[PDB]
Amino acid sequence: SMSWPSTVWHCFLKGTRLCFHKGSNKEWQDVEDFARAEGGIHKGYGSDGLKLLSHEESVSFGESVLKLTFDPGTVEDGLLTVECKLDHPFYVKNKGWSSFYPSLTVVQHGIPCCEVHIGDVCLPPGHPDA
Numbered sequence: 001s002m003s004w005p006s007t008v009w010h011c012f013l014k015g016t017r018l019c020f021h022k023g024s025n026k027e028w029q030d031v032e033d034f035a036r037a038e039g040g041i042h043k044g045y046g047s048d049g050l051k052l053l054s055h056e057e058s059v060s061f062g063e064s065v066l067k068l069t070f071d072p073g074t075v076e077d078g079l080l081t082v083e084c085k086l087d088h089p090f091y092v093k094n095k096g097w098s099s100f101y102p103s104l105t106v107v108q109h110g111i112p113c114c115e116v117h118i119g120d121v122c123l124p125p126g127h128p129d130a
Contacts, residue, residue: 002111009035010124022078046072049121091130093121
């Protein structure tokens with residue numbers, strides 16, 4: 001609808017931290033450090049979308065953050081847990097732009113959003129349905 005913000009890797013914005021449940025690195029890593037380290041252990045990861053399974057809120061170094069767990073749809077690829085800002089937007093298949101905090105997303109990105117819920121399939125930029 002409104003055009004994509006600048007993503008670092010998959011649908012994830014700057015400041016996101018990634019924790020892959022499977023593979024050679026199961027530690028938390030900054031998304032930019034990860035994207036630089038790739039070209040490529042995770043090529044194509046989540047290319048059909050990332051289904052949100054769970055969410056919670058936390059504080060990290062004085063900042064309120066979300067912690068989310070996503071399913072890419074293949075057991076062998078494994079789940080992904082991320083830490084992201086409260087205003088992180090997601091482009092949900094069959095629903096469009098969504099956020100856990102639509103008003104904070106408006107201020108930070110200018111994008112009007114529905115509310116995200118468990119079950120939503122979050123698409124990467126350039127997915128055919130995105």
